[PDB]
Amino acid sequence: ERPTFYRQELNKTIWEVPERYQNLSPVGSGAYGSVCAAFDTKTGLRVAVKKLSRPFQSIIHAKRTYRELRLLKHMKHENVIGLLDVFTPARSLEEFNDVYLVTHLMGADLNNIVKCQKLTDDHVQFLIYQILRGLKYIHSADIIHRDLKPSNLAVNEDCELKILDFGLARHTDDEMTGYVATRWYRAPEIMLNWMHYNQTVDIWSVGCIMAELLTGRTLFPGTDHIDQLKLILRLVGTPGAELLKKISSESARNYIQSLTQMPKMNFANVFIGANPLAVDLLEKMLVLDSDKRITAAQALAHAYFAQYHDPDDEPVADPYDQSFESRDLLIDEWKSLTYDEVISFVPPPLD
Numbered sequence: 001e002r003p004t005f006y007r008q009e010l011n012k013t014i015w016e017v018p019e020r021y022q023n024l025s026p027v028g029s030g031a032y033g034s035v036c037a038a039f040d041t042k043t044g045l046r047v048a049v050k051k052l053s054r055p056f057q058s059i060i061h062a063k064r065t066y067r068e069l070r071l072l073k074h075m076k077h078e079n080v081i082g083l084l085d086v087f088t089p090a091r092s093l094e095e096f097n098d099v100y101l102v103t104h105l106m107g108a109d110l111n112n113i114v115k116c117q118k119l120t121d122d123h124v125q126f127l128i129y130q131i132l133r134g135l136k137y138i139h140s141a142d143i144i145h146r147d148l149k150p151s152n153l154a155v156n157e158d159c160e161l162k163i164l165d166f167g168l169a170r171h172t173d174d175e176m177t178g179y180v181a182t183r184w185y186r187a188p189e190i191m192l193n194w195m196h197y198n199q200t201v202d203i204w205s206v207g208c209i210m211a212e213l214l215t216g217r218t219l220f221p222g223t224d225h226i227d228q229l230k231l232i233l234r235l236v237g238t239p240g241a242e243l244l245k246k247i248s249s250e251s252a253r254n255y256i257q258s259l260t261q262m263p264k265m266n267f268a269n270v271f272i273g274a275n276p277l278a279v280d281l282l283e284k285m286l287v288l289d290s291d292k293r294i295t296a297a298q299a300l301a302h303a304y305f306a307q308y309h310d311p312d313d314e315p316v317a318d319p320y321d322q323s324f325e326s327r328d329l330l331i332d333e334w335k336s337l338t339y340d341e342v343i344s345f346v347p348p349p350l351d
């Protein structure tokens with residue numbers, strides 16, 4: 001039942017993994033955590049294996065670990081990263097200390113691929129279609145990604161795309177500061193914390209990505225939070241009184257009102273030469289009032305995607321119980337929860 005493990009040291013650390021995984025080779029330069037590429041001899045799949053660092057060192061870290069495992073176990077969709085395997089060399093709860101996770105090896109992300117360059121309209125159609133397809137799935141389970149950007153989108157030779165690296169740990173203030181890609185795709189309401197946010201923040205990110213694929217340029221490359229807000233408001237216009245009401249921070253509401261009023265620009269003269277159907281879709285995504293943005297399910301039926309739309313093949317997710325987020329537990333309790341999820345894991349059918 002229990003497989004045989006073997007040990008080796010790599011650039012760093014003792015890795016201890018089932019024999020099925022061969023040819024471990026350090027990847028990412030540690031940008032993704034401690035990650036090795038490998039070949040899984042049981043599936044024939046090229047895989048990424050992550051060893052979690054100090055998963056249970058604190059309450060906050062124990063919960064993070066549990067959170068990532070729960071989320072990865074839930075997701076089963078062509079356009080979303082899933083879990084191939086999860087293991088520990090530990091034989092009991094008492095000795096449980098390390099957690100390893102296994103997924104498809106991704107090669108190129110959309111960032112380091114389309115760096116500084118425009119795509120053809122049919123490629124924009126197909127890439128945005130798949131993002132919205134994965135997002136309909138994610139949103140139907142009441143999961144919000146929260147951090148969509150080109151670097152979290154993986155694409156292979158045949159233009160096939162998966163969404164990766166969900167928002168699982170809140171960013172520091174410093175990484176959100178200045179002229180940084182980490183902030184350029186973020187909805188204004190969450191960038192300035194105007195109000196309680198919801199899944200519609202992801203649709204704002206999609207519009208920012210779509211614009212960039214059409215022009216080859218960052219849509220809102222702000223030098224800081226406030227510079228970025230000015231770039232946004234110049235395009236979509238300053239808030240009307242209806243939206244101002246919904247901003248529950250008095251200080252933010254007050255700052256917005258200090259600004260000279262501006263009308264929404266003509267998108268056809270911004271995105272010169274673009275498919276009129278693409279322009280129409282951009283206007284429906286890039287709307288300041290989040291209540292009024294188009295949803296993923298609605299966008300999928302938009303005429304821009306007539307080439308790819310298939311209502312019988314755009315599935316939704318099983319319900320996802322997130323009650324644990326409200327829950328306050330000891331380190332050892334989070335750890336015991338995690339062990340149960342490791343132990344109960346069943347791999348996906350190879351078909």
Ligand SMILES: Nc1ncccc1OCc1ccccc1
Pocket residue numbers: 027028032035048049050101102103104105106107
């Ligand atoms: N899939 C990957 N491809 C290349 C480098 C890193 C990758 O993912 C790291 C990972 C593995 C397991 C769970 C979560 C993240």
